[PDB]
Swiss-Prot record, chain B:
Assembly with partners or alone: Voltage-dependent calcium channels are multisubunit complexes, consisting of alpha-1, alpha-2, beta and delta subunits in a 1:1:1:1 ratio. The channel activity is directed by the pore-forming and voltage-sensitive alpha-1 subunit. In many cases, this subunit is sufficient to generate voltage-sensitive calcium channel activity. The auxiliary subunits beta and alpha-2/delta linked by a disulfide bridge regulate the channel activity. Channel activity is further modulated, depending on the presence of specific delta subunit isoforms.
Tissue: Expressed in pancreatic islets and in brain, where it has been seen in cerebral cortex, hippocampus, basal ganglia, habenula and thalamus. Expressed in the small cell lung carcinoma cell line SCC-9. No expression in skeletal muscle.
TM ranges: 9-28, 44-62, 71-89, 100-118, 138-158
Protein name in UniProt: Voltage-dependent L-type calcium channel subunit alpha-1D
Topology Extracellular: residue spans: 29-43, 90-99
Function: Voltage-sensitive calcium channels (VSCC) mediate the entry of calcium ions into excitable cells and are also involved in a variety of calcium-dependent processes, including muscle contraction, hormone or neurotransmitter release, gene expression, cell motility, cell division and cell death. The isoform alpha-1D gives rise to L-type calcium currents. Long-lasting (L-type) calcium channels belong to the 'high-voltage activated' (HVA) group. They are blocked by dihydropyridines (DHP), phenylalkylamines, and by benzothiazepines.
Homology family: Belongs to the calcium channel alpha-1 subunit (TC 1.A.1.11) family. CACNA1D subfamily.
Curated annotation (Swiss-Prot), chain D:
Extra facts: Binds gabapentin, an antiepileptic drug.
Known tissue expression: Isoform 1 is expressed in skeletal muscle. Isoform 2 is expressed in the central nervous system. Isoform 2, isoform 4 and isoform 5 are expressed in neuroblastoma cells. Isoform 3, isoform 4 and isoform 5 are expressed in the aorta.
Post-translational modification: Proteolytically processed into subunits alpha-2-1 and delta-1 that are disulfide-linked.
Gene encoding the protein: CACNA2D1
Short sequence motif named MIDAS-like motif, residue ranges: 8-12
Binding site for a divalent metal cation: 8, 10, 12
Protein name: Voltage-dependent calcium channel subunit alpha-2/delta-1
Chain's role: The alpha-2/delta subunit of voltage-dependent calcium channels regulates calcium current density and activation/inactivation kinetics of the calcium channel. Plays an important role in excitation-contraction coupling.
Localization per record: Membrane; Cell membrane
UniProtKB/Swiss-Prot annotation, chain F:
Shown part of the complete sequence: 1314 to 1393 of 2161
Tissues of expression: Expressed in pancreatic islets and in brain, where it has been seen in cerebral cortex, hippocampus, basal ganglia, habenula and thalamus. Expressed in the small cell lung carcinoma cell line SCC-9. No expression in skeletal muscle.
Subunit structure: Voltage-dependent calcium channels are multisubunit complexes, consisting of alpha-1, alpha-2, beta and delta subunits in a 1:1:1:1 ratio. The channel activity is directed by the pore-forming and voltage-sensitive alpha-1 subunit. In many cases, this subunit is sufficient to generate voltage-sensitive calcium channel activity. The auxiliary subunits beta and alpha-2/delta linked by a disulfide bridge regulate the channel activity. Channel activity is further modulated, depending on the presence of specific delta subunit isoforms.
Organism field: Homo sapiens
Protein name stated in the entry: Voltage-dependent L-type calcium channel subunit alpha-1D
Domain notes: Each of the four internal repeats contains five hydrophobic transmembrane segments (S1, S2, S3, S5, S6) and one positively charged transmembrane segment (S4). S4 segments probably represent the voltage-sensor and are characterized by a series of positively charged amino acids at every third position.
Cellular localisation: Membrane
Coiled-coil regions, chain positions: none
Length: 143, 158, 48, 201, 48, 80, 222, 48
């Protein structure tokens, strides 16, 4: 709560990078098949989830940020997916782990400013997209 | 003394050297005749022997220190030193069928010498090397976007 | 040669539609609606 | 021969490579006469018989129809367990309650690839190398064929590749080159005239 | 049939939003880097 | 004979849903810009004319198979 | 019947052209007029026969001179064209270098047999049994031919053609997966033999999209 | 279909690219005095 100034956030960023690597080295097999690496990675993801669920657990002090709400949704979805496989289409709900690398744009201010600039520099060109949808709908109805 | 490098005949001979070097590389094809391989596998031997001679001439006439000032000179000496390794490994016990192909690609980098003195391509690479630092953030954002949708597609359609 | 030349020429004549149909009128690309323009004159004429 | 076909019905074989596995098994039962006893089993985290037989059967015209019908009914689902598949296979070869051939004992593995060598089972069920193991890698894939190659080399077997349909007919008959090796070394005592069943010329 | 056509929004977002980002990566690396080589030679032509 | 009138129902929307503040000018200025330089399109028209004539003259004899890239739908046999 | 009728129209128009062109030189005694006698000379000589018929297409080409804005637009095109005198050279040089690298990498490795069961060209001879649509019950007899890819890397010209097709972004995945399966000098392919070879194609695509977007920005947007 | 590829992608793609890149050139005027334009002109003569 007081030690979380700079060594603590670099640790979270490196943990996110490690989670990205682990989620990238997972081989999706067809129809429930697996290998030893997938089982080991499933065992590893418990640690990651335990650390990411404690991040908000020890987060009191922040609640209204556009990234902390995403963090909380990821944490709650991960917990709800882990508790839904111990008592027993749970694999579909696992597709929220790909949102964890999205935390990297919030942890890097250079990326945070660039994302805001790219999202704010496309407001003037909205009219063009409105015309695109307009023409597409007209042509669909004509067809 | 110092006029044997800046002389117009020297540079116009280097142009012909590079032209012959690229002609020997770009003349390869599937099922080429053996005599073409012979005339082409000795052509590099007489070109590496002459390019190394020119490197020795330029090294001991301009000074050992001032040579490694521009980035292109280091590139040229790297290419020349890599050619020596290729010439000896292809004769020693190390076969490396793929390693042969990669080394012949290095010898294709000598064509940049004739384009070196164009005063416009240098500006392009200079601007890129000075401006990559102001867009590495956007490139990394693009790469993160690629990774995110790669993982999402792997989950959905794996 | 027929198809390659046609593709290159077609791509070269498609550049004439970007340097003579969109870049011909820059009074709109950098419109700068905030400070001044023809919208003020149009609105004033309509109110008049 | 006392043949016993092991079919991999795990998840990774779903798609084209299941179609080739079912075709390779069907085109391989065509090389079994009335003197050969065969059975077909499948394993995906659990080993079971694909048909109603539960032991080696005479593999005549009627019996081979049942196994062939039961092969073109299997679906791919589950994880791969080689130890359970081979333990179940080695137990049916050691039955001796039913009529058998009391001759060549062979296990045929129709799979794609894995990282499991299952060397703890081969050191328990056949230490004397009395059972040959022929392994087939079927389909277009990138899974490790190393363990599949090693399985067929320690047990006097052979390794076969079936990438497409064109290789099915020829790869399912070359296992008789391996099985004829002991007969060649016999010499003059292996040269006995035999007569076939009645068939149409 | 059914809700199997609801997963076609993955290839639309990846195309529309992926192509958009590529414009901002390739237009910004030429507008402010190709126009910087125009003034670069402007001062080189002043000395010539 | 009955389709021409029935199709025209879709164009009653635009006359009232194009009245957005800005989209009218966006379309109007760009159609004026397109109409202001009609000679550049003549170059494309001449290019297409010349290349179509050459193509029908030198490839026009090729037959139309059904598994080939030159078929009943794609051929050089006619100017359109 | 149609072709004969259109032949008579050529007689009338060429007569009109030939009776007017002599009038032009009466008031002379400037350079684009040379094309005016070029077309009429082709037609009368037409009266290799396959060259006179294809060279007589330059009828709308001389309509530029009689038009006011058309000549100005053509001159603007000829001025525009020189803007990319430098880029259009460096991109050609890079395409040539990549063609040579591709020749080194995939020289003769794109061959394959008609049936996907024979790897050597020595085994790809004779007839073979082909099963239609993967059905084992419907076989057909076909001959196996040791064919080569249409867009190969055998020599520098073929490499340049293949790389141009890649840069047009058409059929490039097929070439990529053909190169991934590329085995050796004179053998057939293997499924996903070297996936890492896609780095060559990705880098070429990246640095060609960069240049094509570089000569298009400083042409229309600068 | 022909009118859908002319009025559709071709035309509109002209609008999207023109408008998007129009602000990139507009930002260059802001960049002309924001802190880089004079710096680049500085670091081209000393290197030479
Ligand atoms: C060249 C100068 C202009 C350059 C234009 C530059 C921009 C590029 C735009 C291209 C648009 C092309 C669209 C026209 C294609 C028309 C078409 O596909 O119709 C061909 C068809 C021939 O039919 P066919 O296969 O012979 O069998 C008939 C069955 N009884 O049917 C016909 O032949 C129909 C009768 C022909 C007359 C009407 C068809 C349109 C003619 C072309 C208009 C545009 C040029
Ligand atoms: C930048 C400069 C140095 C260009 C150099 C030109 C050569 C490198 C080019 C132009 C002619 C090209 C040749 C054009 C014609 C042919 C013949 C061709 O082989 C055959 O004609 C028969 C093939 C067979 O026997 O199977 C192989 C490519 C080759 C020599 C090409 C190889 C590359 C060549 C020699
Ligand atoms: C038949 O096979 C069984 C198991 O495959 C052998 O095992 C015996 O089975 C019978 C009952 O079926 C019982 O005697 C015992 O449960 C098993 N063990 C022993 C030691 O008998 C059995 O020996 C085989 N032969 C016979 C004649 O049953
Ligand atoms: Ca498996």
């Amino acid at each position: 709560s007081i030690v979380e100034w700079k060594p603590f956030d670099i640790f979270i960023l490196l943990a996110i990078f490690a989670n990205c690597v682990a989620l990238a080295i997972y081989i999706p097999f067809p129809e429930d098949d697996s290998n030893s690496t997938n089982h080991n990675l499933e065992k590893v993801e418990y640690a990651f989830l335990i650390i990411f669920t404690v991040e908000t657990f020890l987060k009191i002090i922040y609640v209204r940020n556009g990234w902390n709400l995403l963090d909380f949704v990821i944490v709650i979805v991960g917990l709800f997916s882990v508790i839904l496989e111990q008592l027993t289409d749970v694999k579909a709900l696992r597709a929220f782990r790909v949102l964890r690398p999205l935390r990297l744009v919030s942890g890097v201010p250079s990326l945070q400013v660039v994302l805001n600039s790219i999202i704010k520099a496309m407001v003037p060109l909205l009219h063009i997209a409105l015309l695109v949808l307009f023409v597409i709908i007209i042509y669909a109805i004509i067809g | 003394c110092r006029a044997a490098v800046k002389s117009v005949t020297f540079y116009w001979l280097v142009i012909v050297l590079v032209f012959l070097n690229t002609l020997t590389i770009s003349s390869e094809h599937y099922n080429q005749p053996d005599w073409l391989t012979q005339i082409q596998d000795i052509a590099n031997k007489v070109l590496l022997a002459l390019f190394t001679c020119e490197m020795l001439v330029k090294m001991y006439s301009l000074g050992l220190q001032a040579y490694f000032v521009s980035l292109f000179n280091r590139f040229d000496c790297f290419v020349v030193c890599g050619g020596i390794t290729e010439t000896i490994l292809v004769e020693l016990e190390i076969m490396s069928p793929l390693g042969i192909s990669v080394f012949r690609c290095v010898r294709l980098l000598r064509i940049f010498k004739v384009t070196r003195h164009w005063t416009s391509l240098s500006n392009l690479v200079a601007s890129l090397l000075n401006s990559m630092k102001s867009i590495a953030s956007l490139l990394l954002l693009l790469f993160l976007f690629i990774i995110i949708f790669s993982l999402l597609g792997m989950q959905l359609f794996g | 040669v027929y198809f390659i030349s046609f593709y290159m020429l077609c791509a070269f004549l498609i550049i004439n539609l970007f340097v003579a149909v969109i870049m011909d009128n820059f009074d709109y690309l950098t419109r700068d609606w905030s400070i001044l323009g023809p919208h003020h004159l149009d609105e004033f004429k309509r109110i008049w | 021969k006392d043949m016993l076909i092991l079919v991999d019905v795990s998840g990774s074989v779903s798609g084209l490579t299941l179609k080739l596995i079912r075709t390779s098994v069907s085109e391989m039962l065509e090389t079994l006469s009335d003197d050969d006893f065969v059975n077909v089993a499948s394993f995906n985290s659990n080993a079971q018989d694909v048909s109603c037989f539960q032991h080696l059967v005479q593999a005549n015209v009627r019996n081979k129809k049942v196994l062939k019908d039961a092969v073109n009914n299997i679906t791919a689902k589950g994880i791969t367990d080689y130890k359970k598949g081979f333990s179940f296979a080695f137990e049916q070869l050691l039955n001796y309650n039913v009529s058998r051939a009391n001759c060549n004992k062979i296990i045929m593995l129709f799979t794609d690839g894995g990282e499991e060598r299952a060397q703890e089972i081969f050191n328990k069920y056949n230490k004397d190398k009395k059972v040959r193991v022929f392994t087939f890698s079927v389909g277009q894939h990138n899974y490790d064929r190393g363990p599949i190659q090693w399985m067929a080399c320690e047990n006097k077997g052979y390794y076969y590749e079936i990438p497409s349909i064109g290789a099915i007919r020829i790869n399912t008959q070359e296992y008789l080159d391996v099985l004829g090796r002991p007969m060649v070394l016999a010499g003059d005592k292996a040269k006995q005239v035999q007569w076939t069943n009645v068939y149409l010329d | 049939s059914s809700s199997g056509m609801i997963v076609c929004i993955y290839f639309i977002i990846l195309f529309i939003c992926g192509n958009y980002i590529l414009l901002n990566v390739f237009l910004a690396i030429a507008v402010d880097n190709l126009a910087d080589a125009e003034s670069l030679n402007t001062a080189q032509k002043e000395e010539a | 004979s009955i389709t021409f009138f029935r199709l025209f129902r879709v164009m009653r929307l635009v006359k009232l849903l194009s009245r957005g503040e800005g989209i009218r000018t966006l379309l109007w200025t760009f159609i004026k810009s397109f109409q202001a330089l009609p000679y550049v399109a003549l170059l494309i028209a001449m290019l297409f004319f010349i290349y179509a004539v050459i193509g029908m003259q030198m490839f026009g004899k090729v037959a139309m198979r059904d598994n080939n890239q030159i078929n009943r739908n794609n051929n050089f046999q006619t100017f359109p | 019947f149609r072709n004969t009728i259109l032949g008579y129209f050529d007689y009338a128009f060429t007569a009109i052209f030939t009776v007017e062109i002599l009038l032009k030189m009466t008031t002379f005694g400037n350079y684009f007029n040379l094309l005016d006698m070029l077309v009429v000379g082709v037609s009368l000589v037409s009266f290799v026969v396959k060259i006179l018929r294809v060279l007589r297409v330059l009828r709308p080409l001389r309509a530029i001179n009689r038009a006011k804005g058309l000549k100005h637009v053509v001159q603007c095109v000829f001025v525009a064209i020189r803007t990319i005198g430098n880029i259009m050279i460096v991109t050609t040089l890079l395409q040539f270098m990549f063609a040579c690298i591709g020749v080194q990498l995939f020289k003769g490795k794109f061959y394959r047999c008609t049936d996907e069961a024979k790897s050597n060209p020595e085994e790809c001879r004779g007839l073979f049994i082909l099963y239609k649509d993967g059905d084992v019950d419907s076989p057909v007899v076909r001959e196996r031919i040791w064919q080569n890819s249409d867009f190969n890397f055998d020599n520098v010209l073929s490499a340049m053609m293949a790389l141009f097709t890649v840069s047009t972004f058409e059929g490039w995945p097929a070439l990529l997966y053909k190169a991934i399966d590329s085995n050796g000098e004179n053998i057939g392919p293997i499924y996903n033999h070297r996936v890492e070879i896609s780095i060559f194609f990705i880098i070429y695509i990246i640095i060609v999209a960069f240049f094509m977007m570089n000569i298009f920005v400083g042409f229309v947007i600068v | 279909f022909v009118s859908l590829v002319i009025f559709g992608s071709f035309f509109v793609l002209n609008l999207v690219l023109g408008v998007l890149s129009g602000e990139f050139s507009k930002e260059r005027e802001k960049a002309k005095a924001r802190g880089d334009f004079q710096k680049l002109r500085e670091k081209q003569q000393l290197e030479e």
